[PDB]
Amino acid sequence: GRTTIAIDPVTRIEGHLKAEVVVENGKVVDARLSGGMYRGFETILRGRDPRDASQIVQRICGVCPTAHSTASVLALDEAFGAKVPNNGRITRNLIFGANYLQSHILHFYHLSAQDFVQGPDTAPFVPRFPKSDLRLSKELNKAGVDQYIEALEVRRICHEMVALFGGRMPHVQGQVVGGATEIPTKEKLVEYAARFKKVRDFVEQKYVPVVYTIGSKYKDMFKVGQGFKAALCVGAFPLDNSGKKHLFMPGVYAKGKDMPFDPSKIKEYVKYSWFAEETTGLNYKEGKTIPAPDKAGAYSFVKAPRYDGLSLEVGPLARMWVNNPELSPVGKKLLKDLFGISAKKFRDLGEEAAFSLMGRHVARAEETYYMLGAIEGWLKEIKAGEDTVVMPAVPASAEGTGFTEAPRGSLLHYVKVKDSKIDNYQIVSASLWNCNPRDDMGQRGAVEEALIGIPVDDIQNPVNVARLIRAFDPXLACAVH
Amino acid sequence: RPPVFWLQGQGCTGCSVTLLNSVHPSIADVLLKVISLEFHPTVMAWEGEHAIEHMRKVAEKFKGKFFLVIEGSVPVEADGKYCIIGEANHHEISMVDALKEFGPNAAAVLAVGTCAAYGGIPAAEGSETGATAVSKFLGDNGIKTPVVNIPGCPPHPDWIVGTVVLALDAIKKNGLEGGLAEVVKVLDSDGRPTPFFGRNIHENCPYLDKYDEGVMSATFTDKVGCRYDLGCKGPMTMADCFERKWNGGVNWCVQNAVCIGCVEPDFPDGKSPFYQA
Numbered sequence: 162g163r164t165t166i167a168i169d170p171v172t173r174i175e176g177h178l179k180a181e182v183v184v185e186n187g188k189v190v191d192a193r194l195s196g197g198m199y200r201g202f203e204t205i206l207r208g209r210d211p212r213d214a215s216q217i218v219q220r221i222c223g224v225c226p227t228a229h230s231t232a233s234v235l236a237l238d239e240a241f242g243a244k245v246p247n248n249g250r251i252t253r254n255l256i257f258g259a260n261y262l263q264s265h266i267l268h269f270y271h272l273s274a275q276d277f278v279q280g281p282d283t284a285p286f287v288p289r290f291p292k293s294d295l296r297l298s299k300e301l302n303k304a305g306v307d308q309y310i311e312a313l314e315v316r317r318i319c320h321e322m323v324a325l326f327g328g329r330m331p332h333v334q335g336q337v338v339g340g341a342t343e344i345p346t347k348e349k350l351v352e353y354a355a356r357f358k359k360v361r362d363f364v365e366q367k368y369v370p371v372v373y374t375i376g377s378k379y380k381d382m383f384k385v386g387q388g389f390k391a392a393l394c395v396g397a398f399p400l401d402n403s404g405k406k407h408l409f410m411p412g413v414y415a416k417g418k419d420m421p422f423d424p425s426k427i428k429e430y431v432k433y434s435w436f437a438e439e440t441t442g443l444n445y446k447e448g449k450t451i452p453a454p455d456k457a458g459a460y461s462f463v464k465a466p467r468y469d470g471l472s473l474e475v476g477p478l479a480r481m482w483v484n485n486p487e488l489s490p491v492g493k494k495l496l497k498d499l500f501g502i503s504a505k506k507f508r509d510l511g512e513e514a515a516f517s518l519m520g521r522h523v524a525r526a527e528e529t530y531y532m533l534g535a536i537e538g539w540l541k542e543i544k545a546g547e548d549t550v551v552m553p554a555v556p557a558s559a560e561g562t563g564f565t566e567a568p569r570g571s572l573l574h575y576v577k578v579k580d581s582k583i584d585n586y587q588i589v590s591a592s593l594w595n596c597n598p599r600d601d602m603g604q605r606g607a608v609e610e611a612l613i614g615i616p617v618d619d620i621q622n623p624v625n626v627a628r629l630i631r632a633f634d635p636x637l638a639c640a641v642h
Numbered sequence: 643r644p645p646v647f648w649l650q651g652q653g654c655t656g657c658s659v660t661l662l663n664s665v666h667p668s669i670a671d672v673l674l675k676v677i678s679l680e681f682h683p684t685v686m687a688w689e690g691e692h693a694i695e696h697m698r699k700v701a702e703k704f705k706g707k708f709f710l711v712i713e714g715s716v717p718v719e720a721d722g723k724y725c726i727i728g729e730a731n732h733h734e735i736s737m738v739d740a741l742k743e744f745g746p747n748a749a750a751v752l753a754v755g756t757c758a759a760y761g762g763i764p765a766a767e768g769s770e771t772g773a774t775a776v777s778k779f780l781g782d783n784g785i786k787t788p789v790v791n792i793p794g795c796p797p798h799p800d801w802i803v804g805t806v807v808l809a810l811d812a813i814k815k816n817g818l819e820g821g822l823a824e825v826v827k828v829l830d831s832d833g834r835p836t837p838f839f840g841r842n843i844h845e846n847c848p849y850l851d852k853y854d855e856g857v858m859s860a861t862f863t864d865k866v867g868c869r870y871d872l873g874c875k876g877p878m879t880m881a882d883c884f885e886r887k888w889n890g891g892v893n894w895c896v897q898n899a900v901c902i903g904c905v906e907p908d909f910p911d912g913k914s915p916f917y918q919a
């Protein structure tokens with residue numbers, strides 16, 4: 162009574178993903194995810210001037226390039242000994258945070274919303290599954306489409322904000338070792354704040370409400386997709402120049418317990434990944450990337466990262482759970498009205514609902530709101546005209562690690578410099594943590610496990626397989642690099 | 643609206659994101675009024691084997707008349723195992739396979755982005771997947787379909803949209819074969835539409851006076867001097883970024899920092915190190 166289903170490509174994600182599930186008695190009972198495309202940035206980078214890395218590594222992903230830019234320049238800062246000016250710290254936060262808004266808006270509306278909203282009767286919105294389980298009223302559905310179309314302009318405006326101090330987007334020019342390449346002027350800070358107002362309004366008035374609204378028509382989706390119920394956050398957006406206070410603070414959550422984040426406890430397994438057997442079990446400081454595309458038993462170009470042997474998830478859910486901030490006003494309101502739930506802080510959703518298919522869409526909308534306040538702060542904190550960069554020399558031999566949170570989860574770059582050239586460069590990315598295969602111990606990756614128990618009551622219209630995946634906002638370019 | 647299939651090989655999806663930033667026309671207008679984007683895995687409604695089957699049904703219906711956009715390079719090593727883009731009939735589909743299947747039957751191939759056009763970062767020093775430019779991979783396999791390169795890492799949205807409109811207006815006025823001939827006439831030796839890649843950045847740079855005076859910025863944040871000593875590759879780059887700029891006109895690379903020559907065939911290695919001349 163076991164049926165295997167294969168989905169390749171999973172669409173309305175970034176990058177190349179095959180999902181294979183076994184369905185039994187109307188539910189997933191096993192799962193395997195395959196990242197099908199490899200480029201090998203960690204070898205491509207070797208031998209280069211380290212400053213090149215903060216451009217090369219952005220081409221890992223055109224959706225989240227500012228996250229790779231940030232991790233890279235932070236790693237180079239430590240390796241070079243560069244003291245980033247206070248004003249450059251703030252400019253970086255303005256550049257990067259603006260893409261948090263773009264990416265989260267892009268994900269819900271232009272990747273996720275078609276899970277619940279029927280679009281216009283033309284490609285690429287048709288054809289689709291005959292029984293797509295699209296539950297919304299004609300009135301709410303059209304609101305979905307109207308907001309989808311509006312979100313196209315809103316997310317474009319987010320990239321205008323990125324480019325004001327970042328140079329262009331995708332692939333910013335404005336972040337380098339030592340700070341930020343362009344001092345914010347009063348004039349362009351107005352241009353930034355003007356656009357920010359429009360995005361704030363769309364976020365508060367349209368995006369956050371509609372996530373709660375649409376979820377209420379899908380309350381069964383809060384009861385599936387829990388997986389391991391274990392989360393990772395490495396910290397992001399420095400709030401001072403001490404390196405200790407951050408908008409998101411690091412932390413691990415596993416087996417109901419909060420624990421601190423210790424990066425020496427990260428290892429990358431490759432038994433079921435297409436990399437040479439001899440490279441398994443490595444911390445990123447000793448990481449190796451030797452492709453083995455014919456290796457028997459392997460089924461993915463994604464390595465299997467494990468935290469102290471744990472398989473964790475990352476992303477807005479992970480961050481909001483770890484940081485347990487205050488929920489937004491309209492979130493409290495609509496959790497009361499539409500779900501009969503009383504909540505003040507994010508964890509008042511409780512572990513089961515937060516760690517759910519629909520909970521991760523909720524966490525992402527709440528985080529988008531949360532970020533509005535951070536950006537407002539930096540727009541006040543910034544000092545128009547004050548220098549944003551130092552010009553440091555290339556070290557002959559050095560190492561550094563840059564930690565941040567990409568829109569989709571924890572991201573670190575580690576660089577080792579030898580002879581003033583890149584000797585090793587290792588990337589542990591967000592969707593790597595989510596969409597990885599089994600480790601050498603046979604423990605499944607986070608989404609592989611979160612797929613367990615997903616309903617497939619109609620093997621010919623198995624829409625919940627990819628809906629669950631999309632809740633994690635995957636980016637297989639990031640996962641494999 | 644002609645049918646368009648958008649296939650991604652060794653890409654970072656930056657080509658698709660930059661297209662979403664199109665201002666005039668907006669992306670909604672492009673999709674709803676200019677092209678019929680029949681397959682695009684990042685934005686389309688359906689999924690998996692059904693999305694591929696749909697593309698084949700449209701490809702078989704519109705044989706010789708559909709436009710094929712290729713993002714990313716094509717890895718030929720290990721029998722194509724470095725880029726699997728789908729599965730139909732329990733049969734994995736590599737980018738090599740998919741390009742041999744659809745390439746011959748397209749009206750034209752638009753290689754968008756420096757990876758597809760010229761190989762780019764996946765083909766750079768240190769790589770080991772056999773990343774290949776589209777025009778090269780097709781020639782190597784005897785496929786005569788015309789290729790138009792729209793390079794850049796990423797291209798400006800106006801370069802992609804502009805080239806599609808350019809070719810559709812040519813085809814309306816002169817038919818399919820004649821319209822495409824008129825398009826080839828406006829391509830430079832690197833396959834690029836000269837409307838967008840016909841002018842050198844440096845020769846049109848607003849800091850050209852400082853360059854000739856020898857007044858060079860020594861820190862990035864110094865917006866008075868020429869950026870040449872900081873590594874600007876404007877002198878070796880063919881694009882109109884000095885004029886149309888980026889993201890609704892709010893900035894461009896030379897104002898903000900340096901040009902890194904992302905539209906040129908030798909990107910990245912021939913433009914590296916980025917931060918010294």
Ligand code: SF4
Pocket residue numbers: 843844845847848849850851853868869870874875876877896
């Ligand atoms: S070297 Fe660069 S900044 Fe200087 S004039 Fe040329 S294009 Fe402009």
Ligand code: SF4
Pocket residue numbers: 329794795843879880881883894895896900901902903904905
């Ligand atoms: S200015 Fe140079 S690096 Fe920037 S987009 Fe144009 S060609 Fe590419």
Ligand code: FCO
Pocket residue numbers: 222224225228229567568569570571572590591592593635636639640
């Ligand atoms: N966000 C984003 Fe990209 C991924 N996953 C990174 O890191």
Ligand SMILES: [Cl-]
Pocket residue numbers: 224225226227228229260261264567568
């Ligand atoms: Cl980002």
Ligand SMILES: [Fe+2]
Pocket residue numbers: 203464587588589590641642
């Ligand atoms: Fe890695």
Ligand code: NI
Pocket residue numbers: 175221222223224225226636638639
């Ligand atoms: Ni990404």
Ligand SMILES: [S]
Pocket residue numbers: 175222224225569635636639
């Ligand atoms: S991403």
